[PDB]
Amino acid sequence: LGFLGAAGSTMGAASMTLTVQARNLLSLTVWGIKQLQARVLAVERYLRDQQLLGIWGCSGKLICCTNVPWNSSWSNRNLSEIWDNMTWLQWDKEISNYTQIIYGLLEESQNQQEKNEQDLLAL
Amino acid sequence: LGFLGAAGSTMGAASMTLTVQARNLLSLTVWGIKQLQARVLAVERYLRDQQLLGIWGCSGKLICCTNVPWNSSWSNRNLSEIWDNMTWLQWDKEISNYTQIIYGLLEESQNQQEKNEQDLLAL
Amino acid sequence: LGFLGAAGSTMGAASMTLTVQARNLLSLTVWGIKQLQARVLAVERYLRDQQLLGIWGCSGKLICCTNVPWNSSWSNRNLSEIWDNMTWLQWDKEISNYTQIIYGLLEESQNQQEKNEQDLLAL
Amino acid sequence: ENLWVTVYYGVPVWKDAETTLFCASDAKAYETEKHNVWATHACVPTDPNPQEIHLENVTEEFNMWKNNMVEQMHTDIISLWDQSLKPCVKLTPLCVTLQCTNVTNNITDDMRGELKNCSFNMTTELRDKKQKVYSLFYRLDVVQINNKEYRLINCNTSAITQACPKVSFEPIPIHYCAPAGFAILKCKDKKFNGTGPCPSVSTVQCTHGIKPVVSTQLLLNGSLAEEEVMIRSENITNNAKNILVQFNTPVQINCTRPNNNTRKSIRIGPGQAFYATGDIIGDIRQAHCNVSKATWNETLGKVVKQLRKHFGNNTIIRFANSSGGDLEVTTHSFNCGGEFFYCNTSGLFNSTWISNNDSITLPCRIKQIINMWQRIGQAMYAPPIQGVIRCVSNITGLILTRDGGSTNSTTETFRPGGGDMRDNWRSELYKYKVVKIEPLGVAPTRCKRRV
Amino acid sequence: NPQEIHLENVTEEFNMWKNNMVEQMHTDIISLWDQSLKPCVKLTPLCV
Ligand SMILES: *[C@@H]1O[C@H](CO)[C@@H](O[C@@H]2O[C@H](CO)[C@@H](O[C@@H]3O[C@H](CO[C@H]4O[C@H](CO)[C@@H](O)[C@H](O)[C@@H]4O)[C@@H](O)[C@H](O[C@H]4O[C@H](CO)[C@@H](O)[C@H](O)[C@@H]4O)[C@@H]3O)[C@H](O)[C@H]2NC(C)=O)[C@H](O)[C@H]1NC(C)=O
Ligand SMILES: COc1cnc(-n2cnc(C)n2)c2[nH]cc(C(=O)C(=O)N3CCN(C(=O)c4ccccc4)CC3)c12
Ligand SMILES: *[C@@H]1O[C@H](CO)[C@@H](O[C@@H]2O[C@H](CO)[C@@H](O)[C@H](O)[C@H]2NC(C)=O)[C@H](O)[C@H]1NC(C)=O
Ligand SMILES: *[C@@H]1O[C@H](CO)[C@@H](O[C@@H]2O[C@H](CO)[C@@H](O)[C@H](O)[C@H]2NC(C)=O)[C@H](O)[C@H]1NC(C)=O
Ligand SMILES: *[C@@H]1O[C@H](CO)[C@@H](O[C@@H]2O[C@H](CO)[C@@H](O)[C@H](O)[C@H]2NC(C)=O)[C@H](O)[C@H]1NC(C)=O
Ligand SMILES: *[C@@H]1O[C@H](CO)[C@@H](O[C@@H]2O[C@H](CO)[C@@H](O)[C@H](O)[C@H]2NC(C)=O)[C@H](O)[C@H]1NC(C)=O
Ligand SMILES: *[C@@H]1O[C@H](CO)[C@@H](O[C@@H]2O[C@H](CO)[C@@H](O)[C@H](O)[C@H]2NC(C)=O)[C@H](O)[C@H]1NC(C)=O
Ligand SMILES: *[C@@H]1O[C@H](CO)[C@@H](O[C@@H]2O[C@H](CO)[C@@H](O)[C@H](O)[C@H]2NC(C)=O)[C@H](O)[C@H]1NC(C)=O
Ligand SMILES: *[C@@H]1O[C@H](CO)[C@@H](O[C@@H]2O[C@H](CO)[C@@H](O)[C@H](O)[C@H]2NC(C)=O)[C@H](O)[C@H]1NC(C)=O
Ligand SMILES: *[C@@H]1O[C@H](CO)[C@@H](O[C@@H]2O[C@H](CO)[C@@H](O)[C@H](O)[C@H]2NC(C)=O)[C@H](O)[C@H]1NC(C)=O
Ligand SMILES: *[C@@H]1O[C@H](CO)[C@@H](O[C@@H]2O[C@H](CO)[C@@H](O)[C@H](O)[C@H]2NC(C)=O)[C@H](O)[C@H]1NC(C)=O
Ligand SMILES: *[C@@H]1O[C@H](CO)[C@@H](O)[C@H](O)[C@H]1NC(C)=O
Ligand SMILES: *[C@@H]1O[C@H](CO)[C@@H](O)[C@H](O)[C@H]1NC(C)=O
Ligand SMILES: *[C@@H]1O[C@H](CO)[C@@H](O)[C@H](O)[C@H]1NC(C)=O
Ligand SMILES: *[C@@H]1O[C@H](CO)[C@@H](O)[C@H](O)[C@H]1NC(C)=O
Ligand SMILES: *[C@@H]1O[C@H](CO)[C@@H](O)[C@H](O)[C@H]1NC(C)=O
Ligand SMILES: *[C@@H]1O[C@H](CO)[C@@H](O)[C@H](O)[C@H]1NC(C)=O
Ligand SMILES: *[C@@H]1O[C@H](CO)[C@@H](O)[C@H](O)[C@H]1NC(C)=O
Ligand SMILES: *[C@@H]1O[C@H](CO)[C@@H](O)[C@H](O)[C@H]1NC(C)=O
Ligand SMILES: *[C@@H]1O[C@H](CO)[C@@H](O)[C@H](O)[C@H]1NC(C)=O
Ligand SMILES: *[C@@H]1O[C@H](CO)[C@@H](O)[C@H](O)[C@H]1NC(C)=O
Ligand SMILES: *[C@@H]1O[C@H](CO)[C@@H](O)[C@H](O)[C@H]1NC(C)=O
Ligand SMILES: *[C@@H]1O[C@H](CO)[C@@H](O)[C@H](O)[C@H]1NC(C)=O
Numbered sequence: 001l002g003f004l005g006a007a008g009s010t011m012g013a014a015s016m017t018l019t020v021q022a023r024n025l026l027s028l029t030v031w032g033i034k035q036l037q038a039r040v041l042a043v044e045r046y047l048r049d050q051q052l053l054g055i056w057g058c059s060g061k062l063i064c065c066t067n068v069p070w071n072s073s074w075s076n077r078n079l080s081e082i083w084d085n086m087t088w089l090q091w092d093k094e095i096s097n098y099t100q101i102i103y104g105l106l107e108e109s110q111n112q113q114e115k116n117e118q119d120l121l122a123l
Numbered sequence: 124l125g126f127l128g129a130a131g132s133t134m135g136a137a138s139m140t141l142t143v144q145a146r147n148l149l150s151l152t153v154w155g156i157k158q159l160q161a162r163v164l165a166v167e168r169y170l171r172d173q174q175l176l177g178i179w180g181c182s183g184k185l186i187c188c189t190n191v192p193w194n195s196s197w198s199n200r201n202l203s204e205i206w207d208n209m210t211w212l213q214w215d216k217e218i219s220n221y222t223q224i225i226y227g228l229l230e231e232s233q234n235q236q237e238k239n240e241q242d243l244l245a246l
Numbered sequence: 247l248g249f250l251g252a253a254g255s256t257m258g259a260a261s262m263t264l265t266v267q268a269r270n271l272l273s274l275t276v277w278g279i280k281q282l283q284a285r286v287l288a289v290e291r292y293l294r295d296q297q298l299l300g301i302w303g304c305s306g307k308l309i310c311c312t313n314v315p316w317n318s319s320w321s322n323r324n325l326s327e328i329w330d331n332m333t334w335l336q337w338d339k340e341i342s343n344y345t346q347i348i349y350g351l352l353e354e355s356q357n358q359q360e361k362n363e364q365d366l367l368a369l
Numbered sequence: 370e371n372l373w374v375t376v377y378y379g380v381p382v383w384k385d386a387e388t389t390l391f392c393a394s395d396a397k398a399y400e401t402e403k404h405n406v407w408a409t410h411a412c413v414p415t416d417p418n419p420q421e422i423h424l425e426n427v428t429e430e431f432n433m434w435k436n437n438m439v440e441q442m443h444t445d446i447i448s449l450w451d452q453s454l455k456p457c458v459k460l461t462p463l464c465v466t467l468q469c470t471n472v473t474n475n476i477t478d479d480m481r482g483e484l485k486n487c488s489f490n491m492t493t494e495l496r497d498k499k500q501k502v503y504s505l506f507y508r509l510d511v512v513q514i515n516n517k518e519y520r521l522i523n524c525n526t527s528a529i530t531q532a533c534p535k536v537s538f539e540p541i542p543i544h545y546c547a548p549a550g551f552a553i554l555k556c557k558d559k560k561f562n563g564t565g566p567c568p569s570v571s572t573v574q575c576t577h578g579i580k581p582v583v584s585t586q587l588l589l590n591g592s593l594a595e596e597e598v599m600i601r602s603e604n605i606t607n608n609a610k611n612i613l614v615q616f617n618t619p620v621q622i623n624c625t626r627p628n629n630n631t632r633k634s635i636r637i638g639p640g641q642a643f644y645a646t647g648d649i650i651g652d653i654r655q656a657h658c659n660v661s662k663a664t665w666n667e668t669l670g671k672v673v674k675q676l677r678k679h680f681g682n683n684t685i686i687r688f689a690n691s692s693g694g695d696l697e698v699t700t701h702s703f704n705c706g707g708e709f710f711y712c713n714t715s716g717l718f719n720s721t722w723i724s725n726n727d728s729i730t731l732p733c734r735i736k737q738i739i740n741m742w743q744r745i746g747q748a749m750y751a752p753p754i755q756g757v758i759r760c761v762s763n764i765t766g767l768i769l770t771r772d773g774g775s776t777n778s779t780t781e782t783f784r785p786g787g788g789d790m791r792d793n794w795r796s797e798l799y800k801y802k803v804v805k806i807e808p809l810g811v812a813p814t815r816c817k818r819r820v
Numbered sequence: 821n822p823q824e825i826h827l828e829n830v831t832e833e834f835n836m837w838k839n840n841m842v843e844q845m846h847t848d849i850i851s852l853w854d855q856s857l858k859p860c861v862k863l864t865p866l867c868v
Contacts, residue, residue, distance in 0.1 A: 001422075004552060004572050004806070007381040008426020011812065014381055019178055019234045021808055022379030026174050027549035028156055030448050031411035033274055035391040036163070038548040040282070043167050044289050045550050046174075049809050051272050051292075053378060055265055057818075059306025060182030062378045063237055065244050065816025070372040079372065079813065087426075088380045088810060095811065102374055102811050111265045113820060114309055121311050124825075131829030142301055142357045149297050151279055153851050159286070166290050169297075183305030186360055188367050241375075244816045496867045639867050 011091055012083040018062040055107040057114075068109045074098040134214055135206040141185045178230040180237075191232045197221045257337055258329040264308040301353040303360075314355045320344045372813030379808050386805035387437040388551055393544040393575055405537040406453045407446075407581060415544050422572040423557070429570045431556055431802055433563025434603045438553075438801050439794040442545065446581055446790075447741075457533035460750055461524075462637045465489045469511055469519040473653065482508045483734070484653065487519060493636045502635050504645030509696075509711075509736050523738045527748040534644055534752050538707040540590070542578025547803055554802040559595040563799045579797045584703040585787025586691065586714055588796050591765035593617055598671045601799065605679050611786065612769040613796050614675075619763030620668050624658030624733060626708055626758035644752035655732060658701075658712050660764075662727040665717060672767070673722045676783070685780045687721035690714065692772075696736070698788035705760040709736050709751060718785055742790060768792055 003024045006014035026046050028036075058064030075082070075095055082091065095102075126147045129137035149169050151159075181187030198205070198218055205214065218225075249270045252260035272292050274282075304310030321328070321341055328337065341348075392412030404410065467487035474480060488503035511519035523529055547553050553575060556567035582590050592615075599615040633647035673686050680686065691699040691714075700711040712733035739749045770786040 002420070002572070003422055004381045004383070004424055005422050007383075007424045015377060016238075018377060018379040019230055020379070021381060021806070023174070023178055023230070025379075025550050025806065025808055026170060028151075028274075029411050030445065030452055031392050031408065034389045034445075035413060036160070037282070037389055038391045039163060039167060040285060041388070042549040043170060044285055046170070047272060047289060047292070049378070051269070052809070053376070054306040055269055055308075056376060057306060058376055058378070060177045060180060061237065062178075062234060063241050063375065065241060065375045065814065065818050066373060067818045067820075068374045070374060070813040072372075075813070079815065082812065089382045091812065092382050092807070092810065099811065106374065106376070106811075107265055107269070111308060113818075114307065115262075117820075118309050118311060125823070126825055127827060128825050130827045139361075142353055146297070146301055146353070149293060151274075153848065153855055157848075159283070162286060162290060166293055169293070183300040183303060184360065185301075185357060186364050188364060241814075241816060244819070245814075494867065496865070639864060 007089070008087060010084045011086055011088055014088055015063070022062055052103075055110060057110045066106055066109070067113060068102070068105045074102065130212070131210060133207045134209055134211055137211055138186070145185055175226070178233060180233045189229055189232070190236060191225070191228045197225065253335070254333060256330045257332055257334055260334055261309070268308055298349075301356065303356045312352055312355070313359060314348070314351050320348065372815050373817050374811050375814040375816045377810045377812065380810040382807050382810070383552065383804035384807065385802065386551070387441070388548060388803060388805070390438070390441065390545045390547050390575070390803070393546045394541060395544070395578065396541050403537045404535065405539065405541060407449055408541055408543050412543065413546070416574070419574060421555070424554075424570045424572055427570050428566050428568040429554055429556070429802065430566050431561070431563060431800070433601065433795060433799040436795060436798060436802070438545065438798045438803055439791060442579075442794045442798065443791050446583075447743075450741075453536055454530050454532060454749060458531040458637065458641050458643065460529040460531050460637065460643065462491065463489075463521060463529070463643065464524040465491070466514065466518040466520055467506070467511060468516060469506065470516050472505065472649075477653070483655070484508070484649075485511055485519065487511065491635065491637060494639075502645075504633070504635065504643075505648070506646075507735055507737060509734065510738050521738065523740070523748045527740060527746045529738060529748050529750050531643065531750045531752060538704055540580035540582045542580055544575045544578060545798075545801075546575030551803060551805050554804055556800040556802075558800075560597070560599070561800055562599060563601050563795075576798065576801055579794075582703070583790045583793050584701070585697050586701040586768060586785040587622075587703075587764050588613075588615075588766035588768065588793070589622070589703060589762045589764060591615075591763075591796060593619060593763075593765050598675045600672075600675050600679060608771045608773050608775075611789075611792055612767075612771070612783075613792060614672055614767040614769060615796065616668060616765050617671070618668065619765055620660060620664055621761060622658050622660050622764055623759075623761045624656065624705065624710065624712070624731070626656045626705075626710075626735065626754075627654040628656075629757050630753050630755055632753045632755040646753045656710060656735060656758075658710070658731040658733055660717065660729045660731070662729050665729065669717075669720060670722070676781070677724070680775075680781050683724045685721065685723050686783065687780060688718035688783045688785075690718050691784050691786055694786075695788065697742070698786055701731070701733075701785075702787075703762075705762075706758050707751060707754050708758050709739055710734070711736060714785060718783070742788065766796055 001017075001020070003020060005020070006017045026042065053059065053061075053064075056064070056066065058066075077086075086094070124140075124143070126143060128143070129140045149165065176182065176184075176187075179187070179189065181189075200209075209217070247263075247266070249266060251266070252263045272288070299305065299307075299310075302310070302312065304312075323332075332340070392408050393415035394408040394412035395415040396409075397412075397414060398409060402409075467485075467489045469485035469487040471480065471482045472484040472486045485506045485508060486503065487506045488501055490499045491502050492499040493502070506519075510522045512522050514520050521529070545553075553573050555571040555573050555576075557569045557571045558567050561567060577592075580590055594615045594617045597617055600612060601615070602610050602612045604610045605612070629650045631647040631650060632644050635643040635645050637643045669688070676686050677684065693699060696702065696711050701714040702709065702711045704710075710733040712731040714731055716729050716731060737751055737753075739751060741747050741749075767785060768787050769783045772782050772784060775781060
C-alpha cells in the first residue's frame with residue numbers, strides 16, 4: 001500500500017493498485033522562483049500523457065484494451081511468465097526497443113476506427 | 124441566468140444551469156508577476172477536479188451517475204426535500220462530514236468495474 | 247505529410263491527417279523569462295479547446311458527430327462542393343459569421359441529452 | 370493464443386532524474402518572526418505528518434558522491450545569502466586609515482592586542498564636514514600599514530557589505546520537497562556508506578529537517594549514525610579526498626563570548642548606519658569552547674576502531690592538528706548566534722593509537738569581516754551582538770584528511786579539515802535519491818476493444 | 821462592458837474591516853512606487 005508500494009511486485013499484482021499512482025501525479029525570491037517552476041513543470045508533464053492517452057482513445061481510463069495485436073516479435077513470452085514473474089520495471093527495460101513502434105501503432109489504429117465508426121454512423 | 128445566478132435556487136432548479144458555471148472555471152513587473160501567478164494558479168486548480176472527475180469515470184460529463192449507493196447514514200432525507208428545498212450550499216454544509224468517504228468510494232468502485240469490464244472483454 | 251502539410255488540400259483530403267496536427271499542439275534571465283511564458287501560454291491555450299471540446303461531449307475524439315442540424319442558412323452548399331473543393335481555411339472564412347452561434351448550440355444540445363440520458367437511467 | 374496491446378496508467382516504474390526541489394519549512398513564523406537568511410516566510414508549509422512508504426522487494430543503488438541533491442542545495446544557499454546581503458549597507462566609506470591603540474596595553478596579560486581601539490575620520494551628516502569617530506576592532510580585522518595606523522583586512526581585495534541587523538542567523542530546519550510526478554528514495558539501511566546497493570529502500574515526499582549550519586573540522590547539530598561510527602570517503606585510498614565521520618552519539622560542545630559588548634551606531638551617510646562596538650562592560654575575557662575530556666576520549670576511540678577497518682587491523686593511527694590554509698580551514702569555525710568563532714582545535718586532535726568532571730577548553734577568537742568561501746572578491750561585516758553569547762551544540766561528525774607517506778610507513782596521520790561546504794550538505798543528504806515516475810505502460814493481455 | 825449578475829434570494833455577510841482586498845492593494849501600491857523610484861537619480865551628493 002502507498003505510492004509506489006507495489007514497485008517490486010510482479011506485473012500482475014501491481015495492476016490492482018493503479019489508482020494509487022495515478023492520483024498522485026498531479027497533486028519571487030529564490031524560493032519563489034523554484035517553487036513556481038515546480039508547479040509549471042508538474043502540469044505540463046501531467047498533460048503530456050493525458051494528450052497521449054487521448055489520441056489512443058483511453059481518455060478517462062487506467063486500463064484500456066486496444067485493437068492492435070502484439071506481433072510476437074516484440075516479446076515472445078507466455079502470458080503467465082509476463083504477468084506473474086516480471087515486474088513492471090523489468091518489462092519496461094525489455095520492451096523499451098519497441099515502445100516508439102507500439103506507440104505509433106496505437107494512434108494510427110485509433111484514427112482508423114474513428115473514421116470507420118464515422119462512416120458507420122451514416123448508415 | 125449568469126455565472127452563479129442560480130446560487131439561491133433549490134438543488135433541483137440549479138442542476139439545469141450547470142454549463143453556465145462549468146464553462147467559466149478556466150477562461151515581469153509587480154503587475155506582470157501577479158498576472159502570471161493568476162494564470163498558473165487557474166490551470167492547476169482546474170486540472171485538480173478534472174483528474175478527480177476522471178478517476179471516477181465522469182471524464183467529459185457534467186452529470187455522471189455512479190455505481191455506489193447512498194448508505195442512508197450520510198443523509199436520511201427524502202428525494203424531494205433534498206432536490207426541492209435545500210440549495211447546493213446547504214447540502215454541501217450538511218454532507219461535508221462524508222465527502223472524503225464518498226470520494227474514496229467513487230474511485231475504489233470505478234477501478235472495480237474497470238477490471239470487471241477488462242475481464243469481460245476476454246470472454 | 248507533416249505538421250500542416252495538408253493545408254492546401256481540399257477539406258476531404260485533410261480530414262485523414264488530423265492526428266498529425268492534434269499531436270503537435272502541446273509538445274530567470276531574459277531568456278528564462280521568455281522561455282517560461284512560452285510554456286505557460288502553451289498549456290493554457292491547449293486547455294481552452296479541451297474544455298470546449300468537452301462541454302460538447304467530444305472529449306477524447308478527433309472527429310465527433312453531434313446532434314445539431316446544419317440549418318442550411320449557415321451554408322447552403324452541397325456535401326460535395328464543401329468536402330472536395332474548399333480547403334479548411336476557405337470554409338472557416340466562409341462560416342466565421344455563425345461559429346459563435348454553432349458553438350452555443352453544440353453545448354446547449356449536449357446538456358439536453360445529458361439530462362435525457364440521466365432521466366432514462368432511472369427507468 | 371493471440372494477444373492485444375493494452376495500455377496501463379499508473380504503473381510503478383521510475384528513473385533517476387535531477388529536477389528543481391523546493392521548500393517545506395515546518396517552523397514558519399510562529400508568531401515570533403525575526404526573518405533570517407533562509408526559508409522562514411517563503412518556504413512552503415510542511416505536512417504535519419509526512420508519509421513514508423517502504424518499497425518492499427526493491428534494491429536500489431546509491432552513490433553518495435554523484436548526488437545532484439547536494440549540488441543544488443549548494444547553490445540554493447549561496448544565493449540565499451546573496452539575496453539577503455544586497456539590500457543593506459555597503460561599508461565602502463570605511464577604507465580610511467585607523468589610528469588603533471591596544472585596549473589593554475599595560476592593563477593585563479602580556480600586552481596582547483586581541484582588541485584594538487581605532488579612531489578614524491568620517492563624514493557624518495554633511496559630505497563636507499567629517500568628525501572623528503571611533504570603534505573597537507579585533508586584531509583579526511586590522512592590517513598595519515607601513516599608535517600606528519591600521520586598515521581593515523579586507524578593503525584592498527574585497528568589497529564589504531554590512532549584514533542587515535534585523536535578519537537572524539539561527540538555522541531553521543529545511544525540508545527539500547520534490548514536485549508532483551517525482552519521488553525521493555530514502556535508504557533505510559542502518560550501516561549505509563553512501564555507495565552500493567541498498568536492499569531496504571523507502572519512498573518519501575521530501576527529506577527530513579536539514580539545518581543549513583556551515584562549519585569546518587566538525588559537523589555541529591547534524592544527524593547521527595543509528596548504530597556505529599560511519600566513515601565515508603569518495604576514494605578512501607586518495608589523500609586529496611576528505612573523510613566524513615559520523616558519530617552515533619553526540620559530543621556536546623559549550624562555548625561563549627563572555628564579554629558584555631555594546632553596539633553603537635555610526636552614520637556613514639544619509640540614511641545609513643554603521644553598527645560598531647562602543648565598549649565592554651566588565652572584565653575583558655576570552656572566548657572558548659568546552660568539550661568533555663572523557664566523552665571526547667571514548668568517541669575518538671570509536672573512530673579509530675572503524676578507521677582500522679580501512680587501514681589494516683594492526684596499524685598505529687594518530688591524529689594531528691590542521692597543517693595550513695585560511696583561518697576557517699585550520700580552525701574549527703562556526704557561527705554561534707550571529708558571531709563567528711574560529712576555535713583552536715589543537716587539544717582535540719593530539720593523540721596516538723596503537724593496536725592493544727574534566728573538560729577541554731578551546732581558545733576561540735572572533736572575526737567580524739567574513740569572506741565567501743569558494744572565493745569571490747566579496748566579504749560580509751557582521752555587526753556586533755549586544756550581550757553575552759552562550760550557545761551549546763552537538764558534534765555529530767568530523768571532516769578528516771590524510772597525508773602522503775602511507776606507502777612504506779606503518780602509521781597514519783589524520784589532520785582535520787574543512788572549507789568546502791559542499792561536504793556539509795552531503796553529510797545530511799547522503800541517503801536521498803530523486804527519481805522520476807513513468808506511469809505509462811503497455812503489455813499483451815488478450816483484451817480486445819469492442820467495435 | 822463588464823458583466824454583473826444579480827444573485828437573487830442570496831444573502832451574504834460582509835465585514836469591511838477584515839477585508840483582504842485592501843491589505844493586498846496596500847502593498848500593491850507601496851511596491852508600485854518602489855519599482856518606479858529605483859531607476860533614477862539618488863540625491864546623495866546634495867548633503868552639502
Ligand atoms: C545547535 O542547535 C542548538 C539548539 O537547536 C542551538 O542553540 C540555540 O542557540 C541560539 C543562539 O544562541 C539560541 O537563541 C538565543 O537564545 C538566547 C537565550 O535563549 C532564551 O530565549 C529563548 C527564546 O525565548 C528561550 O527559548 C530560552 O529558553 C532562553 O530563555 C536569546 O537571548 C537570544 O535572543 C537574541 O536573539 C534573538 C534572535 O536573533 C532576538 O530576537 C533577541 O531579541 C535576542 O537579540 C537567542 O534567541 C537558542 O535559544 C538555542 N536553542 C537551544 C534549544 O538551546 C545552537 O546555537 C546550535 N549551534 C549551531 C552552531 O548552529
Ligand atoms: C560570508 O560570506 C559571504 C559574504 N558576502 C556575501 N555577499 C556579499 N555581497 C553579496 C551580494 N554577497 C556572500 N554571499 C554568499 C555568501 C555565502 O554564502 C558564503 O560564502 N558563506 C556563508 C556560510 N558560511 C558561514 O556561515 C561561515 C561558517 C563558518 C565559518 C565562517 C563562516 C560560509 C560562507 C557570502
Ligand atoms: C577608546 O579610545 C577612546 C578615545 O578615542 C576613549 O574615549 C575616551 O575615554 C575617556 C575615558 O573614558 C574619556 O575621558 C574621553 O572623553 C573619551 N573620549 C572620547 C572622544 O570618547 C575610549 O574610552 C576608549 N575605549 C576603550 C574600551 O579603551
Ligand atoms: C582626521 O582629520 C584631522 C584633520 O581634519 C587630522 O588631524 C590633523 O592631523 C594633521 C597631521 O599632520 C595635523 O597637521 C592637523 O593640524 C590636524 N588637524 C586637526 C587636529 O584639526 C587627524 O589626524 C585625522 N585622523 C585620522 C585620519 O585618523
Ligand atoms: C592586500 O593586503 C594584504 C596585506 O598587506 C596582502 O597580503 C600580504 O601579502 C604579502 C605578499 O607576500 C605577504 O607577505 C603578507 O604576509 C600578506 N599579509 C597578510 C596579513 O597575510 C594582500 O596580498 C593584498 N592584496 C592584494 C595585493 O591583492
Ligand atoms: C543534542 O543531542 C541530544 C541527544 O543526546 C538531543 O536530545 C535528544 O533529542 C531527540 C530529538 O531531537 C530526542 O528524541 C531525544 O530523546 C533527546 N535525548 C536527550 C538525551 O536529550 C539534543 O536535542 C541535541 N541538541 C541539538 C541537536 O542542538
Ligand atoms: C551587560 O551590560 C548592560 C549595560 O549596558 C546591562 O544592562 C544593565 O543591567 C543592569 C542590571 O542588570 C540595569 O540596572 C541597567 O539599567 C542595565 N543597563 C542597560 C543600559 O540596559 C546588562 O545586564 C549586562 N548583561 C550581563 C549579562 O551582565
Ligand atoms: C554544557 O552545558 C550544559 C548546560 O547547558 C551542561 O549540562 C549540565 O551538566 C551538569 C553536569 O555537571 C548537570 O548537573 C546539569 O544538570 C546540566 N544542565 C543541563 C541544563 O542539562 C553540560 O555539563 C555542559 N558541558 C560542558 C562540556 O561544558
Ligand atoms: C599545530 O600544533 C603544532 C605543535 O603542537 C604547531 O607547530 C608549531 O608551528 C610553528 C610554526 O608556525 C612553529 O614555530 C612551532 O615551533 C611549532 N610547534 C611545535 C611544538 O613544533 C602548529 O602551529 C599548530 N597548528 C595549528 C593550526 O594548530
Ligand atoms: C593553538 O594551540 C596550540 C597548542 O595549544 C598552539 O601551539 C603552540 O605553537 C607555538 C608556535 O607555533 C609553540 O611555540 C607552542 O609551544 C605551541 N603550544 C603547544 C601547547 O604545543 C598554537 O600556537 C595555537 N594557535 C594556532 C593558530 O595554532
Ligand atoms: C599533546 O599532548 C602531549 C601529552 O599528552 C603534550 O605534551 C606536553 O609536552 C610539554 C613539553 O614541554 C610538557 O611540558 C607538557 O607537560 C606535556 N603535556 C602533558 C599533558 O604532559 C602536548 O603539549 C600536547 N600538544 C598540544 C598541542 O596540546
Ligand atoms: C510485426 O513486426 C515485424 C518486425 O519488424 C514487422 O516486420 C511486421 O510488419 C509486423 N506486423 C506483422 C503483422 O507481423
Ligand atoms: C506457457 O504456458 C503453458 C501453459 O501450460 C506451459 O505449458 C508452458 O510451459 C509455458 N511456457 C513457459 C516458457 O513457461
Ligand atoms: C454505510 O455507512 C456506515 C457508517 O459508517 C458504514 O459502517 C457501512 O460500512 C457503510 N456501508 C453499508 C453497506 O452500510
Ligand atoms: C417523503 O416523500 C413521501 C412521498 O409521498 C411523503 O409521504 C413523505 O411525507 C416525505 N417525507 C418528508 C419528511 O417530507
Ligand atoms: C495543388 O494542386 C496540384 C495540381 O492539381 C495537386 O496535385 C495538389 O494535390 C494540390 N495540393 C495538395 C496539397 O494536394
Ligand atoms: C435556423 O437559422 C435561422 C437563421 O437565424 C434561425 O432563425 C432559426 O431559428 C434556425 N433554426 C431553424 C430550425 O431554422
Ligand atoms: C450537388 O450534388 C448533386 C448530386 O448529383 C448534383 O446534381 C448537383 O449539381 C450538385 N450541386 C452543385 C452546385 O454542384
Ligand atoms: C518480496 O519477495 C518475497 C520473497 O518470497 C515475497 O514473499 C514477497 O511477496 C515479495 N514482496 C511482495 C510485495 O510481494
Ligand atoms: C599593541 O600590542 C602589540 C603586541 O606586540 C604591540 O606590538 C603594539 O605595538 C601595541 N600597540 C600599542 C599602540 O601599544
Ligand atoms: C583515553 O585517553 C587516553 C589518552 O589520553 C587513551 O590512551 C585511552 O585509550 C582513552 N580511552 C578510551 C576508552 O578511548
Ligand atoms: C581484523 O584483522 C583481520 C586479520 O586476520 C583482518 O582480516 C580484518 O580485516 C581486520 N578487521 C576486522 C576483522 O574488522
Ligand atoms: C427567492 O424567493 C422568491 C420568493 O418565493 C422566489 O421567487 C425566488 O425564485 C427565490 N430565488 C430564486 C433564485 O429563485
